[PDB]
Amino acid sequence: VHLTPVEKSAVTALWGKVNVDEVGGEALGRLLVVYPWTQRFFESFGDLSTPDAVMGNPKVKAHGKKVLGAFSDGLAHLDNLKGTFATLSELHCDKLHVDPENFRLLGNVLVCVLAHHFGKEFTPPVQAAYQKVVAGVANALAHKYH
Amino acid sequence: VHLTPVEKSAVTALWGKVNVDEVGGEALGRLLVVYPWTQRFFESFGDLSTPDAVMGNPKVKAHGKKVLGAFSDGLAHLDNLKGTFATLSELHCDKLHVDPENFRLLGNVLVCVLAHHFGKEFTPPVQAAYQKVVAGVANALAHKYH
Amino acid sequence: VLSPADKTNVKAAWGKVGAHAGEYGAEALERMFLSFPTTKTYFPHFDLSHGSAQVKGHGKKVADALTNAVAHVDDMPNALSALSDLHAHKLRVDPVNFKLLSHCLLVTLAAHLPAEFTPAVHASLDKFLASVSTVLTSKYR
Amino acid sequence: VLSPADKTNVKAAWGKVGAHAGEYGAEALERMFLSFPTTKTYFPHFDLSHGSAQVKGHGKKVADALTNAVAHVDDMPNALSALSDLHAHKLRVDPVNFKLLSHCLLVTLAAHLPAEFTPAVHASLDKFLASVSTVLTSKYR
Ligand code: HEM
Ligand code: HEM
Numbered sequence: 001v002h003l004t005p006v007e008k009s010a011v012t013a014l015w016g017k018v019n020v021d022e023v024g025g026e027a028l029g030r031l032l033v034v035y036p037w038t039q040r041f042f043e044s045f046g047d048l049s050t051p052d053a054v055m056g057n058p059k060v061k062a063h064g065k066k067v068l069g070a071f072s073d074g075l076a077h078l079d080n081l082k083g084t085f086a087t088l089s090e091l092h093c094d095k096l097h098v099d100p101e102n103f104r105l106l107g108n109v110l111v112c113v114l115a116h117h118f119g120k121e122f123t124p125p126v127q128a129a130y131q132k133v134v135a136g137v138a139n140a141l142a143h144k145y146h
Numbered sequence: 147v148h149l150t151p152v153e154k155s156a157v158t159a160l161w162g163k164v165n166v167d168e169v170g171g172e173a174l175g176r177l178l179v180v181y182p183w184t185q186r187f188f189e190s191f192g193d194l195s196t197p198d199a200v201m202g203n204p205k206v207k208a209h210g211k212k213v214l215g216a217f218s219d220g221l222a223h224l225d226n227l228k229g230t231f232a233t234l235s236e237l238h239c240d241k242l243h244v245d246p247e248n249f250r251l252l253g254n255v256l257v258c259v260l261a262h263h264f265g266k267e268f269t270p271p272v273q274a275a276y277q278k279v280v281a282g283v284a285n286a287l288a289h290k291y292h
Numbered sequence: 293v294l295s296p297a298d299k300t301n302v303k304a305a306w307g308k309v310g311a312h313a314g315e316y317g318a319e320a321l322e323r324m325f326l327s328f329p330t331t332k333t334y335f336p337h338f339d340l341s342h343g344s345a346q347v348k349g350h351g352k353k354v355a356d357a358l359t360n361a362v363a364h365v366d367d368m369p370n371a372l373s374a375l376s377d378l379h380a381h382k383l384r385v386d387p388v389n390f391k392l393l394s395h396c397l398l399v400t401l402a403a404h405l406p407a408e409f410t411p412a413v414h415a416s417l418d419k420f421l422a423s424v425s426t427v428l429t430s431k432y433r
Numbered sequence: 434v435l436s437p438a439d440k441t442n443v444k445a446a447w448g449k450v451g452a453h454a455g456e457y458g459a460e461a462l463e464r465m466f467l468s469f470p471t472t473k474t475y476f477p478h479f480d481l482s483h484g485s486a487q488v489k490g491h492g493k494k495v496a497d498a499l500t501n502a503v504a505h506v507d508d509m510p511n512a513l514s515a516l517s518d519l520h521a522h523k524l525r526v527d528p529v530n531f532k533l534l535s536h537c538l539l540v541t542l543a544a545h546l547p548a549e550f551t552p553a554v555h556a557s558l559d560k561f562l563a564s565v566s567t568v569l570t571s572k573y574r
């Protein structure tokens with residue numbers, strides 16, 4: 001996808017404020033809480049019986065950190081998301097067989113998490129810029145299905 | 147997408163048997179009957195009040211013929227669907243703003259129409275080959291959104 | 293919500309399918325596994341090859357659940373309650389997958405019902421399978 | 434189907450939103466139009482610019498429909514029946530679009546409810562908006 005300079009500005013400015021040790025875990029956790037079927041892919045993560053257990057689960061936090069790292073890598077290569085996500089696409093599609101709709105869902109949860117954290121700062125135009133980004137990452141991660 | 151020689155064989159063999167003046171209209175008609183909201187984009191087509199009216203509507207049949215032509219063009223360029231569909235993508239996405247989910251829906255209706263017409267000849271492996279094709283056309287037609 | 297005409301159309305397709313329903317359920321599963329490979333992840337312990345007695349047996353189960361839904365069409369939520377619990381709670385079946393199987397079920401009926409599968413009946417069947425799917429994903433907790 | 438805990442969570446978010454509900458409905462629409470441009474096709478006669486009195490007025494209407502649904506949560510099908518007819522029959526609103534607005538409504542609540550928008554309440558709100566959406570697309574004929 002192609003972001004305009006204003007959208008790239010909106011995205012980059014906000015991202016520099018993100019706590020990269022926490023936001024990933026918050027997004028992954030909520031994905032598992034809000035869309036329970038996604039828990040199917042994390043049988044080894046332990047206690048996921050309640051929202052509190054999921055959010056405080058050390059493995060969820062650690063894994064979310066890895067997911068966020070990937071979004072950061074994409075934010076750094078917005079004009080080549082496909083190349084950036086090629087390896088993760090093989091993993092999520094060819095090996096894990098995660099339905100691509102869940103890539104869209106995680107991106108949207110991330111958007112909800114950013115809105116929660118930044119409040120009024122996460123304006124409608126800023127959200128729009130971020131939707132282009134998560135749509136881009138989701139499409140890149142799903143390339144192997146195409 | 148990439149079809150194997152066996153899948154390309156399954157597809158090409160069946161397609162040569164398709165009546166190209168009728169199958170498009172049947173698919174478009176059913177799309178309008180089964181997914182009524184799609185009628186929103188065809189206000190100028192006239193009587194679409196009943197299934198029979200839709201199926202017998204001359205404009206639906208004529209337009210379906212154009213849609214089928216495009217699928218034929220894609221079947222002829224399976225390794226370059228994006229280039230083949232670039233112009234239609236601008237039209238359906240940038241100008242018409244049709245949600246891409248409907249591209250998937252039309253492809254699936256086409257699959258239902260082919261199954262209806264060929265019966266037992268439209269085997270599970272043959273259907274699988276066709277799903278790769280309509281998924282490919284839908285993804286190509288949606289490229290402008292990506 | 294299913295209309296009187298939809299209920300009539302579905303009952304009629306059901307009648308025409310007749311005793312083949314079980315075989316057709318298996319065919320729809322096979323079409324789903326070949327067409328949408330991601331769905332195979334839910335059946336790791338099944339031999340999914342053509343002719344598999346496991347797929348054959350399961351097809352009959354799917355068919356029976358669908359006929360139970362048409363026989364209690366005015367109250368599918370209740371009739372399909374236990375199955376909803378199983379697919380959501382225990383199996384964690386991704387909601388997108390119900391659309392995939394519903395499409396394969398439609399394709400199977402179309403390949404077996406030349407006269408029945410009219411545009412109107414096609415629409416009724418689609419609504420019915422969508423209704424069934426809505427119930428089977430209503431238990432997400 | 435909404436659980437007792439979900440109904441409680443939704444009612445509580447509703448209470449916290451309070452008299453801002455109307456303004457928030459407008460904000461959610463604005464976010465939807467900017468984020469998902471295809472949705473703008475349904476409002477050709479609306480000025481969709483920021484500050485538009487039309488978007489402001491419509492946001493209040495959307496908000497009122499949602500509060501009517503939460504106030505009659507045990508029977509939304511009935512409460513939202515007229516709106517379902519309008520969106521499906523007259524407007525021909527593509528079902529995919531309900532997911533887009535529901536997401537923008539969640540985003541709006543999240544940007545306005547620091548303490549309320551916990552993972553559990555987020556899940557309850559998502560279920561509620563999904564329930565509302567199911568009713569509003571149930572009238573496809
Ligand atoms: C927005 C899309 C997503 C991104 C950017 C993403 C990113 C990542 C990253 C960076 C890893 C670690 C790979 C490594 O250790 O080398 C990974 C692993 C994994 N992801 Fe995701 N992911 C996404 C969505 C999903 C979804 C939606 C699911 C399932 C509901 C999923 C399930 C997994 C699992 C099961 C692993 C562990 C793989 C393993 O270690 O064997 N991912 N993901
Ligand atoms: C599988 C995807 C589809 C293909 C291959 C396709 C193909 C075509 C073709 C070849 C044309 C004629 C263009 C011309 O006259 O030069 C066209 C036009 C059009 N299509 Fe599609 N189409 C698809 C899906 C859709 C869907 C799902 C909708 C709406 C529900 C839609 C709405 C229209 C309309 C409104 C026009 C008329 C445009 C105009 O003449 O101004 N199309 N399409």
Ligand code: HEM
Binds near residue numbers: 378
């Ligand atoms: C029209 C929709 C569907 C119907 C009517 C249906 C019905 C059934 C029935 C009757 C059973 C047996 C229940 C029991 O043994 O108590 C079952 C089990 C199961 N279903 Fe479905 N199902 C549907 C869709 C799906 C989908 C979409 C998936 C996954 C892609 C799925 C995956 C499974 C699995 C994995 C089992 C358990 C298999 C086993 O261990 O024996 N079902 N289903």
Ligand code: HEM
Binds near residue numbers: 498516534569
């Ligand atoms: C949470 C879901 C939604 C709710 C609660 C909702 C509610 C409403 C309400 C209360 C009205 C006014 C009804 C009247 O005047 O009698 C309305 C009208 C309308 N809605 Fe929605 N709606 C929803 C989703 C959508 C979506 C997703 C679209 C399209 C993308 C849409 C498009 C429209 C349009 C175009 C009108 C008529 C506008 C006009 O001409 O004034 N709605 N909606």
